[PDB]
Design a protein around this ligand. Structure first.
Ligand SMILES: *[C@@H]1O[C@H](CO)[C@@H](O)[C@H](O)[C@H]1NC(C)=O
Ligand SMILES: *[C@@H]1O[C@H](CO)[C@@H](O)[C@H](O)[C@H]1NC(C)=O
Ligand SMILES: *[C@@H]1O[C@H](CO)[C@@H](O)[C@H](O)[C@H]1NC(C)=O
Ligand SMILES: [Ca+2]
Lengths: 324, 123
């Protein structure tokens, strides 16, 4: 599956490259989050801008440039080639949607960009882009620990590394984040260890190592204590992307989620929600676990009038745009 | 007086979206998402059916007018993605021998399944 063709950015400036690295980088300018830069002609150029909401680390603007298409996501709005568009916007090879809790831009055979809207942002790239990319997401050569941080045979700190992949505005001179002093807190109550090493992500321990995620959970605990679940969410996403089946870890106290009356909030639900417009879409799907709202088995979704998930034999039909 | 050999039905999906279905009907449809070009997975029982073919319009250098296609030849538990000029294999189910065969027929990728032969001009 999507073994090592994924990079991510979450929570308190935590960056995860394709090959498995994790590092914190508290930058606050525009950065080349990834880019086709070892090719005669570039295919994609995805950039991030990270900012502050009062104190919360967020992503304020993404600019994906791909094959002559410019896509600027910011302020809860999407600009397609300079024009605002209403979601979803679809064209040959491109589709952008408000699917689930996020904004997902899939440029078929190029990339898959999920953006939760505030802090998370995840890139899936084609296997043919190996070794030809460069940016915070790394080089996609498959070797994590050895080739991202050697600038002319010298090893760099994540602050320096993230500062190399910097890009100022035409009239902007953004500074660099001075190193954060030592940390504190750690996991005193054991919440990170109890959850991450708990039952839910059992098989996730067999695919993705949790050490960096444990550290990030502790570091977020040092930050506000309503925002420690970002690392758990990211670990769920990564475990789902490697191939393993994450299990439900959310409890009414552990960052509770809500879904509509007939829709349940699941970790690892089938991405293709069967809906009696196409009540058998979920037959031979190929896509890993995805989190979001889902329907209890048997009662497919009703996308024709949006009455929630409905039994197969009580949902409407459509003829010529007329509901029956 | 003609020999009574059966002749293979033919569907043609080409160009900016012209289709000539099996029954000889012709029409034009400019779709951008993934469209089921064929399947046996439609019936009072979907599960006694075997194959499934989806296509969608790839632009090869931009996001504009179509330049090529992307085929998804499912056969039972196998799978074959046809894009970008050649084929792949994402076989996920039971790992037996291929129920398909692959051949380079002139300027075509031809994939047979002993009763169902798909020819793709590679564009
Ligand atoms: C987003 O855009 C709206 C207008 O569409 C504006 O009122 C608001 O201040 C912007 N920012 C946020 C964080 O909502
Ligand atoms: C990846 O790129 C580096 C850069 O020179 C090269 O030395 C190496 O052989 C490449 N390996 C693969 C598998 O592409
Ligand atoms: C096929 O569908 C019918 C209802 O149309 C059902 O009674 C029968 O059990 C199904 N057979 C199989 C093998 O699923
Ligand atoms: Ca590397």
């Amino acid at each position: 599956a999507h073994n090592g063709r994924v990079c991510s950015t979450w929570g308190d400036f935590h960056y995860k490259t394709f090959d498995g690295d994790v590092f914190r980088f508290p930058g606050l300018c525009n950065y080349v989050f990834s880019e086709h830069c070892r090719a005669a002609y570039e295919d994609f150029n995805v950039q991030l801008r990270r900012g502050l909401v009062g104190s919360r680390p967020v992503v304020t603007r993404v600019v994906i440039k791909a094959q002559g298409l410019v896509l600027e996501a910011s302020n809860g709005s999407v600009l397609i080639n300079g024009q605002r568009e209403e979601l979803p916007y679809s064209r040959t090879g491109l589709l952008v949607e408000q699917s689930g809790d996020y904004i997902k831009v899939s440029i078929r055979l190029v990339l898959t960009f999920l953006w939760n809207g505030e802090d998370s942002a995840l890139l899936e790239l084609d296997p043919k882009y190996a070794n030809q990319t460069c940016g915070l997401c790394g080089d996609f050569n498959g070797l994590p620990a050895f080739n991202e941080f050697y600038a002319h045979n010298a090893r760099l700190t994540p602050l320096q590394f993230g500062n190399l992949q910097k890009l100022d505005g035409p009239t902007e001179q953004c500074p660099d984040p001075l190193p954060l002093p030592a940390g504190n807190c750690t996991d005193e109550e054991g919440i990170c260890h109890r959850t991450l090493l708990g039952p839910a992500f059992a098989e996730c321990h067999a695919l993705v190592d949790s050490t960096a995620y444990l550290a990030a959970c502790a570091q977020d605990l040092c930050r506000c204590p309503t925002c420690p679940c970002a690392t758990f969410v990211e670990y769920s996403r990564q475990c789902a992307h490697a191939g393993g089946q994450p299990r439900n870890w959310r409890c009414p106290e552990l960052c509770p989620r809500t879904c509509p009356l007939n829709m349940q909030h699941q970790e690892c639900g089938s991405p293709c929600t069967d809906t009696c417009s196409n009540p058998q879409r979920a037959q031979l799907c190929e896509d890993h676990c995805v989190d979001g709202c889902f329907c209890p088995p048997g009662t497919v979704l009703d996308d024709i009038t949006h009455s929630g998930c409905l039994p197969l034999g009580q949902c409407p039909c459509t003829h010529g745009g007329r509901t029956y | 007086e003609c020999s009574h050999r059966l002749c293979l039905g033919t569907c043609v999906a080409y160009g900016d979206g012209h289709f000539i279905t099996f029954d000889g009907d012709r029409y034009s449809f400019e779709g951008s998402c993934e469209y089921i070009l064929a399947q046996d997975y439609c019936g009072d029982n979907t599960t006694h059916g075997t194959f499934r073919i989806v296509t969608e319009n790839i632009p090869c250098g931009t996001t504009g007018t179509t330049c090529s296609k992307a085929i998804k030849l499912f056969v039972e538990s196998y799978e074959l993605i046809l894009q970008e000029g050649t084929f792949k294999a994402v076989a996920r189910g039971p790992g037996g021998d291929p129920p398909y065969k692959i051949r380079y027929m002139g300027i075509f990728l031809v994939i047979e399944t002993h009763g169902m032969a798909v020819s793709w001009d590679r564009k």
